[PDB]
């Protein structure tokens, strides 16, 4: 099924190198890079979702990033991926990008945010394609022989390649709480909150409207958004929802590994 | 040109007159484009890929693109015992030195 | 002690005798206060005064 | 080509998790103690020990 992306949404995750040399939480964290195509094509999985938007519908001109609590739209025209030099993207649908890439010891993927910032994530990655045949050639000639190889085919089909989805963990946010003097109030920007304190608090729990916790000191207060009605990929580098795992669901990841001649 | 401190602007000498241009069109590249990481007045910080040359350039108000190129062998020294290319998720902290991003005196 | 000079008369480097708005009340002459001495430690405070201006709205 | 499969890490605040041991082709799991992970907008756990 192709329109699974009504159910599941983009996210922030911890990127090791946000282009400036510092690690930070990024809309563009790349979770896996895979290079099984002997033709040297590269399949990249990213925390964006592309080919769709907010108001959950396919749109080949857009992608959606997570603007911390709310999914938000940006133009596909300003997605990029580069290695030692610019790659040409050969397909993008959902979490997945195909690229054709020059040899390089890094992969950096990025986009322009709706507020005209540029965001990227950079991983160490030794991209050096295998040679097909007996000549270390650089780009295909207008005359030659054909040899067997393999490619991530440019089709967004039901591939029988599957990735699992889970609901988010409770998302913490220090701005859900304010010290009104002598008490702390939990405040609710229309997402249901879980909260906990140890200020003699007998009544930790949940709310869908603003609440006061009496005697409370903001250091001894904790709050997180909890009723997520959308799912995520169950990546490393975001917490699991519970010890048991979670209630699942799947996505068929596009671009299957066809055999073909080069 | 009016000495106002607009972050989005830069000024250059058009013959006898200071003249303005857009910050977003300043670039520095070596073998490939460098991430600028700070600028003020005459100075730029950049993080650059390895390369045997350096060029800085900007687009003029009159849409023409200026650049300047020097030979400059850049190959930054290793930290620790591995010739790595970009920082990992997992590793060890080692002491090194950096141009701090703050424009302090 | 430390001090600064108006090419002849001498004063403590908190301000030049022209006072704030200096570069707009003795234009370019303001910079010659730094020509014939900049070797004494106080001269960055003369620079701090010389290139600071006090328009009608200011109220510290 | 092997695939290494890694689910989201379970982090428990304020108490020890324990190894939910299972037979899978080269399975491994480990419990790391005294973590204090941050999400984008705050610490995930309540306490820092």
């Amino acid at each position, epitope marked *: 099924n192709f329109n699974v992306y009504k159910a599941i949404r983009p996210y922030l995750a911890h990127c090791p190198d*946000c282009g400036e040399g510092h*690690s*930070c939480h990024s809309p563009v964290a790349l979770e896996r890079i895979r290079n099984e195509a002997t033709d040297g094509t590269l399949k990249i999985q990213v925390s964006l979702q592309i080919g769709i938007k907010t108001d959950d519908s396919h749109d080949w001109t857009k992608l959606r990033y997570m603007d911390n609590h709310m999914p938000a739209d940006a133009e596909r025209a300003r997605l990029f991926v580069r290695t030692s030099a610019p790659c040409t993207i050969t397909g993008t649908m959902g979490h997945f990008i195909l690229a054709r890439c020059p040899k390089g010891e890094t992969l950096t993927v990025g986009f322009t945010d709706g507020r005209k910032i540029s965001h990227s994530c950079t991983h160490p990655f030794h991209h050096d394609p295998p040679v097909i045949g007996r000549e270390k050639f650089h780009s295909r000639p207008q005359h030659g022989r054909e040899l067997p190889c393999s490619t991530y085919a440019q089709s967004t089909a039901a591939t029988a390649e599957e990735i699992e989805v889970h609901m988010p963990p409770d998302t913490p946010d220090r*701005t859900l709480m304010s010290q009104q003097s002598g008490n702390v109030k939990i405040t609710v920007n229309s997402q249901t909150v879980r909260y906990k304190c140890n200020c003699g608090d007998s009544n930790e729990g949940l709310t869908t409207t603003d609440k006061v916790i009496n005697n409370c000191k903001v250091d*001894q207060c904790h709050a997180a958004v909890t009723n997520h009605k959308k799912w995520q990929y169950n990546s490393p580098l975001v917490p699991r929802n519970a010890e048991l795992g979670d209630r699942k669901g799947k996505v068929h990841i596009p671009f299957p590994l066809a055999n073909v001649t080069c | 040109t009016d000495d106002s401190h607009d972050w*989005t602007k830069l000024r250059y000498m058009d013959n006898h007159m200071p003249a303005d241009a857009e910050r977003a069109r300043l670039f520095v590249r070596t073998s490939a484009p460098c991430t600028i990481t700070g600028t*003020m007045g005459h100075f730029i910080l950049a993080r650059c890929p390895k390369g045997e040359t350096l060029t800085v350039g900007f687009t003029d108000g009159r849409k023409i693109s200026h650049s300047c190129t020097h030979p400059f062998h850049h190959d930054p020294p290793v930290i620790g015992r591995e010739k790595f290319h970009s920082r990992p998720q997992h590793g060890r902290e080692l002491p090194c030195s950096t141009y701090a991003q703050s424009t302090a005196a | 002690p430390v001090m600064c000079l108006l090419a002849n008369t001498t004063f403590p480097c908190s301000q030049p005798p022209c006072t704030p708005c200096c570069y707009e009340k003795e234009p370019e002459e303001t910079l010659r206060m730094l020509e014939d001495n900049v070797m004494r430690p106080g001269y960055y405070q003369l620079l701090q005064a010389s290139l600071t201006c006090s328009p009608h709205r200011q109220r510290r | 080509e092997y695939k290494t499969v890694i689910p989201s890490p379970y982090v428990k605040c304020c108490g020890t998790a324990e190894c939910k041991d299972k037979s899978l082709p080269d399975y491994s799991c480990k419990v790391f103690t005294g973590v204090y992970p941050f999400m984008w907008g705050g610490a995930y756990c309540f306490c820092d020990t």
Partner: antibody
Amino acid sequence: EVQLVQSGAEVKKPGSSVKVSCKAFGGTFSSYAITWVRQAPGQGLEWMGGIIPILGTTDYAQKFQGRVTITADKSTSTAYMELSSLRSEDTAVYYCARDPPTHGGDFNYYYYGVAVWGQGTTVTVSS
Amino acid sequence: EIVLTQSPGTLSLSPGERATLSCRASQSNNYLAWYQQKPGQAPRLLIYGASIRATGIPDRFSGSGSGTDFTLTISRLAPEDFAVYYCQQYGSSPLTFGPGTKVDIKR
């Protein structure tokens, strides 16, 4: 020195599009890293994400662009917001009277200076 | 990330005493700075930090810290020194404002 000036309070209806006033002075006579912070009553401070140092392009922080969907003026000292289609929950003091707020991701960095503060206009979402 | 955590949530002192405020973060790298709010009053700069420092009120304030946490101290509290006191480090990548510390001179 730098000095900031605003209108005392704005009497506004919910669902309107509203200018929020500023001019900046005090040692500059023209623009210098102007930005906004906005605080609803009983909240802690929050930098008004639509306006980090907007003096040649309009900002947003992460979050914002909900009902706080907003643009901000670059022009000489006159850092006006246009806060558009606001709601009752946006009743706050809007402190334009605020110091150079050095940004990032965006690759440039700013001085510490003398700093500046002051008043914050109460946009009084009321009927 | 970073998550500026002011360690004291609330304080009370006699006039004549010295207050000290502390803030904990995972890394710093650029100047976090201190500002305060008396109920209904306009803020002003107390102090800047991270490696250098500069301070806006004629000096009865000082600020310092490295390797763990960052601090502000007020020498001899006396007059209208009642406020909530905050520290912050501006926009950039997702990172938020400080939570604030209430302090005042005793009635």
